[PDB]
Amino acid sequence: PLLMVPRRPGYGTMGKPIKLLANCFQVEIPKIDVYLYEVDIKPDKCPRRVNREVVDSMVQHFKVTIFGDRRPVYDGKRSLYTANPLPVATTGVDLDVTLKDRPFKVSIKFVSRVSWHLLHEVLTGRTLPEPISTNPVHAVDVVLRHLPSMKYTPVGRSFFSAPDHPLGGGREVWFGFHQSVRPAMWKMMLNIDVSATAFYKAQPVIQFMCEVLDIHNIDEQPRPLTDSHRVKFTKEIKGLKVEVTHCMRRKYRVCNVTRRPASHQTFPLQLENGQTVERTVAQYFREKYTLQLKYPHLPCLQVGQEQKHTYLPLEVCNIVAGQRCIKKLTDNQTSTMIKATARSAPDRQEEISRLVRSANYETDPFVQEFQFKVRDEMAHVTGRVLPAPMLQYGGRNRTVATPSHGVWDMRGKQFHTGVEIKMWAIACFATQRQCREEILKGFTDQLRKISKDAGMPIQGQPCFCKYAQGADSVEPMFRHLKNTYSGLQLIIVILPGKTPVYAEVKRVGDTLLGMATQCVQVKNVIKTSPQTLSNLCLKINVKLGGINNILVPHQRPSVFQQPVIFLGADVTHPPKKPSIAAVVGSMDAHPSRYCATVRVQRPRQEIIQDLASMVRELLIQFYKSTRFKPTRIIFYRDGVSEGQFRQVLYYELLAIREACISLEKDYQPGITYIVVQKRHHTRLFCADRTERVGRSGNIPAGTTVDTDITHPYEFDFYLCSHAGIQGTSRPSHYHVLWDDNCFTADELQLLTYQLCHTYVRCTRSVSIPAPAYYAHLVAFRARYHLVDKEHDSAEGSGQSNGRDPQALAKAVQIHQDTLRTMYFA
RNA sequence: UAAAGUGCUUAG
RNA sequence: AAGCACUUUAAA
């Protein structure tokens, strides 16, 4: 049966009101039935751009019969839309279109009609809405997307165009926007955000090579390139598109570069009657084209197939404009781009506004034919700044921290329940020359002092201290350390940086060894900063079950008046690699301690294939530490795309239902299902310049919005719960997909904001609630758990196929000592 | 691998 | 290529 998403149970009333601007723009649509036609192109699986050009040419030539004065819109797929009905029948209409010259056949056919009248009735709330191309909001999206997709180079939901800001290496940054539409209160809204990316600069291939290899001058010192030069240049040119200047335009896909120059590059010239004349490329272009090759000492692009084997000098080829860099940018290019692409919050807002002001929607033919009117000014909103919760730390005095501006420090505070660390070891995978014995000795001295001042005094001398240069030497070492020492709290592995040592250390200490490990980079060991040490101590104390702080028992919502558990779930995708799904669960009464379980799943699967069992295990452990039955389950979810919300819900909800049918008997606790997501393109700004926080100029921590830019009838809200420091903050969006607990807007909003302050790894306000963050961490920890076994699967005699049997599910299974604990930090 | 925030990821 | 990069973080 169909599911029923609960509606708005009310709006929020808590917190200081604040005026805001938003990138959402209103859209006037007529309450008119508009007609949808299913378009099929006969050469299948083509680019969307060529399909768009096909239909444009079709409309150009076939208006005498069919389209006439109309100007339909097309999604690049099997969806065309038209304002007035079209003079074609139920049966399809096959038309021929021309475009070396390869024509297409197209079959357009009416399927149904979408009523924007029903949409207008939904947005105003006059009618209750819940009793691909067939929904009307998608048609609005297509109408608004049609024009920019002809003027600008389209990527995904976004649009770019050429400007000049060289990144280096024949690359440049193209600016542009992201466009999206969504139904909000009273009006369709249009999201427009600023984006930029990397493209190959359009220029002669001579200069592209010149810029790739940094041969600043080649004219005056004419040099024939090298082996290393050629390898790098082939790496950077192989796969790209080039145009030929000696023939009007002529475009090829370059697939290799010759090993030898045009002077020495010989091919069998093909004569009529199948005759052969061996000739060199430079000779060929001299005798057929009357072209004195300026650089015949330079190699040639091989554009043709293995049968044809065409050879073009770099001298005549240009880089075709409009090809985006897919291969990873370097460190240098990344730094340069973020130097150029960085915008603070007010800068970003004053960019978006001028951009949408330049778009001139009033003079867009495809907006005019559908009687659209999009608002030119940003959306004015009013939001509420929630009150941050207090946190009780421990010690003799029981200090309490008041988080100002979504941040506090542990300086002067102690853990609620500190732990003594009696037996501990340390393993430097750095060399003797990287850190002297004295360096690590002082490092450990100050770590011990700061730990005692944190209320968690790590006591005594290191039980073990030894260097190691072997990645495959961590399995023996740990084994030794497990048996010689009985009751070892933890070890520390100091690392030189990125290394497989970390992967195998985590794999052993979490699956084989089953003991606590804290890894530290050498620089932080040798350049000591107390803040780093304090965060390390936080992670360690949590790793030994020590509760850092608790949420003040007084300042809490009424939901805590009953045993409640808190769950966060996340799924991470391979890109034929396995997918990883993790779910966590609070173990204590106050939301600080979490256990977790993790499973492996089919690649590219959004839904969580197995859920009930996982929830089962979690619930069990809750009883084990609570002896109580959780009456309310608060499920936080991240990962599901907006396209596939409800059906996932069904299984997941019926899974949790199932997981609660098992425990005891006649057990139906209150389930509340919320989906968190940070991917959206809604960005809220301060309408009052005075209230911008920090140099970034963001909104304050605790800002929430429940009004005219949110959902018409479903229970969603924005909560920018984090200190915005760098640029425009990302307001995490929450959407209530289920509530049996019947909670008001104020209650759930402030609960999520409080959960954003209960993060153990950081004495700050984090963007999303703690269970979701922990689930993400569990996913990544399992991802490292299943890295291809060192010196066994890699380079098996370059990728290696996985082992699908249940041993893969046990390669992610955690040693029993490390499963019940918070090894996530 | 002290951490958070951010933007490039990477999805025709 | 799961992984980069930058900014900030225990003076008073």
Swiss-Prot record:
Molecular function (GO) terms listed? double-stranded RNA binding; endoribonuclease activity, cleaving miRNA-paired mRNA; metal ion binding; miRNA binding; RNA binding; RNA endonuclease activity; single-stranded RNA binding
UniProt EC number: 3.1.26.n2
Q: Where in the cell is it found?
A: Cytoplasm, P-body
Residue ranges for the region (Interaction with guide RNA) are 502-539, 726-773
Q: Name one GO biological process term.
A: miRNA-mediated gene silencing by inhibition of translation
Q: Could you state one GO cellular component term attached to this entry?
A: cytoplasmic ribonucleoprotein granule
Ranges for domain PAZ come to: 204-321
Q: Does the record bear Acetylation in its keywords?
A: yes
Please verify whether the record's keywords include Nuclease: yes
Instruction: Provide the Piwi domain boundaries.
Output: 490-787
| Sequence positions that bind a divalent metal cation | D570, E606, D638, H776
Its subunit composition reads: Interacts with EIF4B, IMP8, PRMT5 and TNRC6B. Interacts with APOBEC3F, APOBEC3G and APOBEC3H. Interacts with EDC4.
Family of the protein in this entry: Belongs to the argonaute family. Ago subfamily.
Described purpose of this protein according to its UniProt entry: Required for RNA-mediated gene silencing (RNAi). Binds to short RNAs such as microRNAs (miRNAs) and represses the translation of mRNAs which are complementary to them. Proposed to be involved in stabilization of small RNA derivates (siRNA) derived from processed RNA polymerase III-transcribed Alu repeats containing a DR2 retinoic acid response element (RARE) in stem cells and in the subsequent siRNA-dependent degradation of a subset of RNA polymerase II-transcribed coding mRNAs by recruiting a mRNA decapping complex involving EDC4.
- Can you name this protein? Protein argonaute-3
Whose protein is this, by species?
A: Homo sapiens
